[PDB]
Amino acid sequence: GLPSINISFKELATTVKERSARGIIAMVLKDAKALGLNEIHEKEDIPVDLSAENKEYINLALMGNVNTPNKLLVYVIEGEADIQTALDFLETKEFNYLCMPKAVEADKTAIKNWIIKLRDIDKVKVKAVLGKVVGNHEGIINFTTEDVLVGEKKYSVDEFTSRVAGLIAGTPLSQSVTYTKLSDVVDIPKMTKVDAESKVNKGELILIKEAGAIRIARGVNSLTELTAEKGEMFQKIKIVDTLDIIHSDIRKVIIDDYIGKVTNSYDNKCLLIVAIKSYLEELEKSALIESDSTVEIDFEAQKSYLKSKGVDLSYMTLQEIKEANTGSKVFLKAKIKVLDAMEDIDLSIEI
């Protein structure tokens, strides 16, 4: 059939568990030394030229949760530099969560728009942990807890996003961060429970004092506008992470191995679909998703494409529409159910 595509899906299925348990974090830092990109897998890879402040943010991220973050991409830019430059740079780098400990309001707006663009236009499923940003979008995690006391130092809400990003990256796909305890935090500002429940339902990720310890109140992103196809499940950090790794894996094989290398006929689209479903069957075995995932030609997306090309669909059967030539375009629809979730999720894949 399509040997090169089956090989690629077989490799990714073999590592999806590992890659899910230990994510990658992009961190933009303001500093005068060690400019550019710094890959950091451990504390020893940290350039000694960075300020002790920046070194603390890096270490906060390495704590993780169940596991530590697989890798940190630390992009250093000079003060006064345009944030849009670090973002432009990261568009060709592989990461899961972006944070910026020293972001100002102007920076946050740029990242928010940037993240939304990558996810909904470029189809690059990345996320950001920002401080006090009403993102109303699954791609933005809105951490809002101020004056986080670790050891004998009070980190600001923006600073602590380094710890929050690492904690999420070090959490397996099968686990929530809801009520995860942060033993390194010894105090936080007093907060009425009414203010806490209100903030959560407004899309804020917060720390709370609960039964002597400090823990994450609920692992939610900033999404508050819900639809029939994008409902409560899309507010959940762990669910979005599951959808993102699956979408990324499928889109990567299609882009790397199919587009332009395989004739994009209906018969080859069917072979591709079968290959994608075989990958999903592997994820089903690995306990990421429930059984009975489906993948099909995205009928409404392909219909819209044909209409944009002036194709008249009035003589055409449903099968003829599915089989129609779409040049180098691929329109697929995947129906998956993440483990223990209450509803199926439709995943649109378009190249």
Numbering used by the authors: 4 to 354
Describing publication, verbatim:
A rather recently identified group of PTLBs are the R-type “diffocins” from Clostridium difficile, which constitute the only Gram-positive R-type PTLBs known to date. All R-type PTLBs consist of an inner needle-like rigid tube surrounded by a contractile sheath. Binding triggers extensive conformational changes in the baseplate, accompanied by contraction of the sheath, which, due to extensive interactions, drives the rigid inner tube into the cell envelope. Here, we have determined the crystal structures and SAXS envelopes of the R-type diffocin tube and sheath protein CD1364 and CD1363 in their pre-assembled monomeric state.
